[PDB]
Amino acid sequence: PQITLWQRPLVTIKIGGQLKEALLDTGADDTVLEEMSLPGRWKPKMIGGIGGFIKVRQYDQILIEICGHKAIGTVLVGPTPVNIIGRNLLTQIGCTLNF
Amino acid sequence: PQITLWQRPLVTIKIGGQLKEALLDTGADDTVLEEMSLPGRWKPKMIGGIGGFIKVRQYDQILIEICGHKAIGTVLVGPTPVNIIGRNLLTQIGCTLNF
Ligand SMILES: COC(=O)N[C@H](C(=O)N[C@H](Cc1ccc(-c2ccccn2)cc1)C[C@H](O)[C@H](Cc1ccccc1)NC(=O)[C@@H](n1ccn(Cc2cccc(C(C)(C)O)n2)c1=O)C(C)(C)C)C(C)(C)C
């Protein structure tokens, strides 16, 4: 698969055996997911962002499926307006900028 | 070039006869750059962000050479931690997300 950028790169994902939609965001260090609940334990933390900050719940070692490809990694859960897939998981699935 | 993502896709650009580093950000609709001066007229605008909106100046028909590639379009100036290069301009340099 190869994705142009004329629309928003909205890809579908599966976490917790649930179907979600997410943004393929290369300017995100971390993966930040909407309000949802997850197994395992977690540290609170502030994430940066354009103007101001938000509290993310940090879940390590989450199994996530981005678009057909399995990846394991840290996942941040908080008051975000969209599910954001950052570099940390984008690498895992061999995603790469190409012009 | 092919940019894998183990590190921030920070690249080099040229605007108003300046060289600046900027992030290649596929989860950004527009291009927003740090406080600088540019030709012509601007509208006020707000931008969403993760943790709230910031006031920006909107400029049109602005020329950016991104990574050796020439492009034109709407650029936003304001209080951002980094020059973000968005889709509005990435499409132009033929940029595509690959895996
Ligand atoms: C290191 O900091 C870091 O990794 N922070 C990240 C971050 O904020 N990344 C950069 C920014 C960044 C990067 C690096 C640093 C940095 C780097 C080094 C040192 C210090 N700072 C700081 C900020 C911006 C990011 O790509 C966001 C993601 C996003 C996308 C959509 C909605 C909310 C958030 N993009 C934007 O904020 C851009 N933006 C905002 C709204 N939109 C349109 C849109 C799309 C989809 C849905 C909607 C809704 C539902 C809201 O209607 N709107 C859009 O495109 C914008 C930038 C143009 C405003 C994450 C928090 C995402 C991880």
User: Could you tell me the residue ranges of all domains in chain A?
Assistant: 1-99
* B28 alpha carbon – ligand 1 mean position (Å): 6
- Under 8 Å between Cβ of A47 and A32: yes
DSSP string across B48-70: --SS--EEEEEEEEEEEEETTEE
Q: Residue B49: which region, alpha, beta or left (left: phi > 0; alpha: psi -120 to 50)?
A: left
> Given CB atoms, is B35 within the 8 Å cutoff of chain A?
no
> B30: which DSSP letter?
S
The answer for residues whose C-beta is within 8 angstroms of residue A51's C-beta and 6 or more apart is B47, B49, B51, B52, B53, B54, B79
- Under 8 Å between Cβ of B41 and B86: no
A29 an active-site residue?
no
At the top level of CATH, the class of B1-99 is mainly beta
Measured CA distances, A44 to A41, A60, A76 (Å): 10, 12, 9
Give the three-class secondary structure for B21. strand
CA–CA dist B93, B81 (Å, integer): 24
What resolution in angstrom units was achieved for this structure?
A: 3.1
Method of determination used here:
X-ray
Q: Which of A9, A49, A53 sits opposite B97 (nearest CB)?
A: A9
CA–CA dist A85, A32 (Å, integer): 7
- Under 8 Å between Cβ of A59 and A77: yes
For a pocket test of ligand 1, which of B11, B76, B84 has the largest count of ligand atoms closer than 8 A to its C-beta?
Answer: B84
- Under 8 Å between Cβ of A21 and A68: no
